[PDB]
Amino acid sequence: LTPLAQMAEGMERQDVSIDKWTLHAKQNLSLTEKEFYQKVQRLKQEYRQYDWVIAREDKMIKAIGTYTDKKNRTSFRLQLVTTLKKHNPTSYLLYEQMSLETPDSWNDTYEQFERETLGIFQEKVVIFTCLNGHLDDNMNIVLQKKANQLLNEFQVEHVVEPNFVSISAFTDEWEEYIMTSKHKMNLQIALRSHTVTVGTPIVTT
Amino acid sequence: LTPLAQMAEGMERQDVSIDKWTLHAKQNLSLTEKEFYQKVQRLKQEYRQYDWVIAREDKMIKAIGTYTDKKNRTSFRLQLVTTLKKHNPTSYLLYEQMSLETPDSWNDTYEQFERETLGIFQEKVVIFTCLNGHLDDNMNIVLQKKANQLLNEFQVEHVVEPNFVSISAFTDEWEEYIMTSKHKMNLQIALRSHTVTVGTPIVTT
């Protein structure tokens, strides 16, 4: 069900390798300097797990809370921001979960986050899901696929090496053939990591 | 019809870029040293276009005739070989056509070669076709394809840059969405030359 489960599982099927997932939620707020440090003080009482840093790059103030859950191989960030210079100040609270590792259950972790969200924000907020991943650099997989596309392009018998693929084949498409040591062939396809070689009856030397 | 036409056209359709084609034919023969130089002498009379080199890396002798047709952007090699040390010698004549350029007509060139073959060998011989080619290194084409596979993986709106692709999309698959400046979206796919990023409703910063 959860967008996390779906995005993940969709990415695998599409051969995307997952490097990192993050879940985040944000709540706009309106905070005086005074209210800001009040909120910070409450956050430090309620969520003792975080290590806090206050940063003030003017005219803005940032309370950044940080914590990594080693048991669950997951990281959290709670961040309160206000822009200091305004008699109608724009502020927000941001809650963020992150990991470099696939969790036991994509669904239990999303439902957990959503759950914690309500405790932190005391309101139902939009939850943002973002996955990072990479494509498979194994040049053996692309070499082999095209080989087949070509084989079918035409209409076998086979190989495979470090960065190499070769095929012998047959089709009732041409006059010529050769029989030698058990068997009987008239098309050679050869890819190398990109190089293509196509020959009738064989690619010679 | 000709295997050359077919191999070529099959390769293009399969996105293989052709670097080089070669056609060749070979005829086993049986040649005394004396008969070998006789044959060479006849070849030099009959085919005045070739420049000849005799090479003798023992105990074998090689007459290599070479000629490039600038009008037809095509190259020829006629090669007579005998192994010198034997009182039953194994010899052959090899005729070879080559080009780095696609010809006006794959079919007219194969039929031409076949034709010349009969004049040279005075017998019908097996004709060997071999193409060399490369795969498209334009990383833009693979980035875009996977993007779509992913888009359909899920169920848009679009971009494209030097080595980059991004999409905004929508599906009735989840609760959330956003409307801002004309339009309405809840999936962002982003590839970079390999990097993948997938987000709901948007990939933020």
Q: Which of A119, A140, A161 is the last residue of a domain?
A: A140
Q: Which residues of B touch A137 (CB under 8 A)?
A: 194
Residue B38: in which H helix or E strand, if any? helix B33-46
Handedness of CA B172, B178, B182, B185 (dihedral sign): negative
Residue A105: CB atoms within 10 Å: 13
Residues B167 and B188 sit within 8 Å (Cβ to Cβ): yes
Contact at CB, B195 and A126, closer than 8 angstroms: no
Contact at CB, B132 and A197, closer than 8 angstroms: yes
Residues of A at the B interface (Cβ-Cβ below 8 Å)? Answer: 3, 6-7, 10-11, 13-16, 24, 126-135, 137, 146, 149-150, 153-154, 173-174, 176, 194-204
Cis preceding-peptide flag for A44 (omega within 30 of 0):
no
Look up residue B95 and give its two tokens. 């005729």
Nearest one of B41, B120, B36 to B77, comparing CA atoms: B120
How many angstroms from the chain centroid is the CA of residue B3?
14
Residue A150 burial class via C-beta count within 10 angstroms: exposed 0-12, middle 13-18, buried 19 and up: buried
Residues B2 and B107 sit within 8 Å (Cβ to Cβ): yes
Residue A115 CB-half CA count within 13 A? 6
Pick B197's closest partner by Cβ from A132, A154, A200: A132
Q: According to the entry, how was the structure determined?
A: X-ray
**Interface mutation vs chain B, best among A9, A174, A198, A203, most B CBs within 10 Å:** A198
- Is the same domain home to B112 and B132? yes
Q: Which of B120, B140, B160 is the last residue of a domain?
A: B140
- Is the same domain home to A40 and A72? yes
| Separation of alpha carbons A50 and A67, rounded Å | 5
Q: Which of A103, A122, A140 is the last residue of a domain?
A: A140
Contact at CB, B10 and A173, closer than 8 angstroms: no
Cis preceding-peptide flag for A20 (omega within 30 of 0):
no
Q: Which residues of B touch A198 (CB under 8 A)?
A: 7, 10-11, 16, 130-131, 133
Torsion of CA A144, A150, A153, A159, to 10 degrees: -60
Please give the residue range of the domain that contains residue B172: 141-205
| DSSP conformation letters of B48-110 | TT-EEEEE--SSEEEEEEEEEETTTTEEEEEEEEEESS-SS--EEEEEEEEESS--S-HHHHH
Contact at CB, A198 and B7, closer than 8 angstroms: yes
A86-A91-A93 Cα angle (round to 5): 165
CA of B121 vs chain A CAs: smallest distance (Å): 18
Residues A43 and B187 sit within 8 Å (Cβ to Cβ): no
Q: Which residues of A touch B173 (CB under 8 A)?
A: 6
| CATH code of B152's domain | 3.30.360.40
| DSSP conformation letters of B119-173 | HHHSS---EEEEEEEEE---HHHHHHHHHHHHHHHH------BTTEEEEEE--TT
CA of B14 vs chain A CAs: smallest distance (Å): 7
Mapped onto helix, strand or coil, the DSSP state of residue B8 is: helix
- Is the same domain home to A20 and A90? yes
List, in sequence order, every residue forming a beta bridge with B164; answer none if it has no partner.
Answer: B161, B192
Question: Alpha helix locations (H) across chain A?
Answer: 3-13, 33-46, 106-121, 139-154
| Separation of alpha carbons A200 and A128, rounded Å | 56
- Is the same domain home to A94 and A38? yes
- Specify the residue for token string 């359909």: B152
- Is the same domain home to A67 and A114? yes
CA of B133 vs chain A CAs: smallest distance (Å): 5
Which residues does A47 contact at the CB level (< 8 Å), separation at least 6? A65, A78
- Is the same domain home to B195 and B155? yes
- Is the same domain home to B102 and B176? no
List, in sequence order, every residue forming a beta bridge with B165; answer none if it has no partner.
Answer: B191
| CATH code of A120's domain | 3.30.2030.10
Could you tell me how many CB contacts below 8 A there are between chain A and chain B?
118
Contact at CB, B197 and A149, closer than 8 angstroms: no
- Is the same domain home to B158 and B58? no
Residue A137: in which H helix or E strand, if any? none
- Is the same domain home to B124 and B181? no
Residues B5 and B102 sit within 8 Å (Cβ to Cβ): no
Mapped onto helix, strand or coil, the DSSP state of residue B203 is: coil
Mapped onto helix, strand or coil, the DSSP state of residue B17 is: strand
- Is the same domain home to B98 and B131? yes
How many domains does one find in chain B?
Answer: 2
In angstroms, what is the C-alpha Rg of chain B? 29
Q: Which residues of A touch B92 (CB under 8 A)?
A: none
Cis preceding-peptide flag for A201 (omega within 30 of 0):
yes
- Is the same domain home to A10 and A71? yes
Residue A26's region, left for phi above 0, alpha for psi from -120 to 50, else beta, is beta
- Is the same domain home to A78 and A50? yes
Nearest one of A40, A10, A8 to A21, comparing CA atoms: A8
Residue A196: CB atoms within 10 Å: 24
Nearest one of B91, B46, B95 to B75, comparing CA atoms: B95
In angstroms, what is the C-alpha Rg of chain A? 29
Question: Alpha helix locations (H) across A122-184?
Answer: 139-154
| Separation of alpha carbons A167 and A161, rounded Å | 12
Look up residue B108 and give its two tokens. 């007219």
Helices B3-13, B106-121: crossing angle, 10 deg rounding: 150
| Separation of alpha carbons B70 and B63, rounded Å | 23
